[PDB]
Amino acid sequence: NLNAVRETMDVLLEISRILNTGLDMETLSICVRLCEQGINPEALSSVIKELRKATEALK
Amino acid sequence: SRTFLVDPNLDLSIRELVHRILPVAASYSAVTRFIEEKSSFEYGQVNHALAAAMRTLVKEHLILVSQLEQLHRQGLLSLQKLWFYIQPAMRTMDILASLATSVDKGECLGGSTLSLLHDRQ
Amino acid sequence: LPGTLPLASQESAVVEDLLYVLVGVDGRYVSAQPLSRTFLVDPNLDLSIRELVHRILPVAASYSAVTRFIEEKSSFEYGQVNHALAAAMRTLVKEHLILVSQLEQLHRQGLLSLQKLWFYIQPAMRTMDILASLATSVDKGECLGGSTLSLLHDRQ
Amino acid sequence: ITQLFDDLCEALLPAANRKRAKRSLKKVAYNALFTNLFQLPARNKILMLSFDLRVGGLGPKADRLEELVEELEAVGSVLDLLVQLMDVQSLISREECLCHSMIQETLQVMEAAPGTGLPTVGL
Amino acid sequence: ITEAALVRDILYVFQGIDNIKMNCYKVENLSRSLRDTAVRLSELGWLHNKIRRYTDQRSLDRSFGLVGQSFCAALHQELREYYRLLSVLHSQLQSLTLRRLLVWTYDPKIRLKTLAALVDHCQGRKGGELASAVHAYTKTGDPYMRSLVQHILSLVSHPVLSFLYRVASDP
């Protein structure tokens, strides 16, 4: 199965690359596995945009 | 095999750099003459489609000269800036100017023109 | 020929000449001498200048011994420590070259008097005095490896 | 699930206190997760973005976005999360903004007050 | 001779094209404070020749192999960037001076120091023996060089790992 769940995870990177989302390969597997738990994705759109916001105040 | 002449009275700080840009023109005046000749039927059904697929690149080389003149009007095109812009063209028009001179050296038509493209970014 | 030049104006010739010696290139009047560097200023100059010139040079002589420490202790036959010590000792040399650039651009407007110079380089006279002391104490007793990491633990 | 939010908070953390920021960023993850919880098909939302692709050109890319969601059928809640988040003239206009963004980034430091852009003088 | 005139010729000596003529670029008047700084600056352009001759002499013969190409075609991606820097420096000449160049070109005085000394350590090596002589430059420790050469190795060792995923053969 791990061969299938690798391909399905590899295709999903491209549709996140041309949609111009800042999610790299590591943060994607984190968010995919976290969405795979059952958390509502309308909220995750806010934590990433805020974690990236407080990260910019440091630099 | 084209030879060029620049100027008797010009700055030496220019002529040494002019001779660094021309090798993309001389390597171009031997590709456009390969298209207009090896398109004759008496050369097989391979030396044709080789000249067609060798024409689309000439089209994209004519667009790269258009975008330079439109960028030249605003004066943003210095001579030093030119030597860097054409570098993708100095490598491609150096490959085709080597096939078009090695397919006509030993007269090839048919399979012997498909072998040379298998031995030769 | 500074003897035929006025006092308030010839100062504008030394400051733009002295602004080059701090880089490593030789100068017009304040020259360098062959090889711990020794300098020569002028036989006929105002004494009210030479006493202050000798107060600025100790940042150049302390610089001509750091840039020679980089170009030598970068050779492989010195370990994987005497290398990264010479790299991290290079970023400061870069920031010392920016501090000389911003002075020449400020020199064009004439806002740079000799007295004003002695105060600007003070952060550089303290830093290039630290590195010119490590680069002369790592080569005195030949150190490579751990014995070059001990010296940086005993030594703003 | 209590750990998958801890690994997520590590990836978005940019590499270099890196030991207390993760403790404070896990708050921003929880302080923002429960705001929505306190307060329509899936493939249709892609087509509405497929349309806006074809309008501004780049047709085949839009014919690809629909090509994958057709094979991803033979998971629906995952794509619902992603939707939430002259060829030569552009070349000569890029290699010209670089020379405008390279001579500016260094002349803004070369000509200023002595010791502004320098970090060692700020000590 | 004005200082601006020197800034005009130096921007060419950085390439090989010569007041400053051609092993040190002996300049030939002007004050001593100017000739000295030109000498060091002009010499950086001389290095650029030694790295250009190799990627031009060996781009001629067709008996250099498959590794000797990915090396001779990875010394060019590290030269287009050196041609982007010369682009920016020329747009400002229309202000920058000698003492302002030293800080601008203090870093590309090192990359043009490793590459111009990486093509001499591997002169007659072809095939895998070249991918083994650009790896003997990684045991250096210098975090700026070990992260440059450890990239050219990632290109030169791509053809080697192409045969492997597919050792002297006998015809």
UniProtKB/Swiss-Prot annotation, chain A:
It is found in: Cytoplasm, Cytoskeleton, Microtubule organizing center, Centrosome; Cytoplasm, Cytoskeleton, Spindle. One of its GO terms (cellular component) is centrosome. Its main location: cytoplasm. Transmembrane segments: none annotated. Required for the recruitment and the assembly of the gamma-tubulin ring complex (gTuRC) at the centrosome. The gTuRC regulates the minus-end nucleation of alpha-beta tubulin heterodimers that grow into microtubule protafilaments, a critical step in centrosome duplication and spindle formation. Belongs to the MOZART1 family. This is Mitotic-spindle organizing protein 1. The gene is MZT1. The chain holds residues 17 to 75 of 82 of the full protein.
Swiss-Prot record, chain B:
Ubiquitously expressed. It is found in: Cytoplasm, Cytoskeleton, Microtubule organizing center, Centrosome. Belongs to the TUBGCP family. It is linked to Cortical dysplasia, complex, with other brain malformations 15: An autosomal recessive disorder characterized by global developmental delay, variably impaired intellectual development, speech delay, facial dysmorphism, microcephaly, and varying degrees of cortical malformations including pachygyria, thin corpus callosum and subcortical band heterotopia. Most patients have generalized seizures. Component of the gamma-tubulin ring complex (gTuRC) which mediates microtubule nucleation. The gTuRC regulates the minus-end nucleation of alpha-beta tubulin heterodimers that grow into microtubule protafilaments, a critical step in centrosome duplication and spindle formation. Plays a role in neuronal migration. Component of the gamma-tubulin ring complex (gTuRC) consisting of TUBGCP2, TUBGCP3, TUBGCP4, TUBGCP5 and TUBGCP6 and gamma-tubulin TUBG1 or TUBG2. TUBGCP2, TUBGCP3, TUBGCP4, TUBGCP5 and TUBGCP6 assemble in a 5:5:2:1:1 stoichiometry; each is associated with a gamma-tubulin, thereby arranging 14 gamma-tubulins in a helical manner. Gamma-tubulin at the first position is blocked by TUBGCP3 at the last position, allowing 13 protafilaments to grow into a microtubule. This is Gamma-tubulin complex component 2. It comes from Homo sapiens (Human). The chain holds residues 243 to 371 of 902 of the full protein.
Swiss-Prot record, chain E:
It is found in: Cytoplasm, Cytoskeleton, Microtubule organizing center, Centrosome. Ubiquitously expressed. It comes from the Eukaryota. Belongs to the TUBGCP family. Component of the gamma-tubulin ring complex (gTuRC) which mediates microtubule nucleation. The gTuRC regulates the minus-end nucleation of alpha-beta tubulin heterodimers that grow into microtubule protafilaments, a critical step in centrosome duplication and spindle formation. Component of the gamma-tubulin ring complex (gTuRC) consisting of TUBGCP2, TUBGCP3, TUBGCP4, TUBGCP5 and TUBGCP6 and gamma-tubulin TUBG1 or TUBG2. TUBGCP2, TUBGCP3, TUBGCP4, TUBGCP5 and TUBGCP6 assemble in a 5:5:2:1:1 stoichiometry; each is associated with a gamma-tubulin, thereby arranging 14 gamma-tubulins in a helical manner. Gamma-tubulin at the first position is blocked by TUBGCP3 at the last position, allowing 13 protafilaments to grow into a microtubule. This is Gamma-tubulin complex component 3. The lineage of its organism: Eukaryota, Metazoa, Chordata, Craniata, Vertebrata.
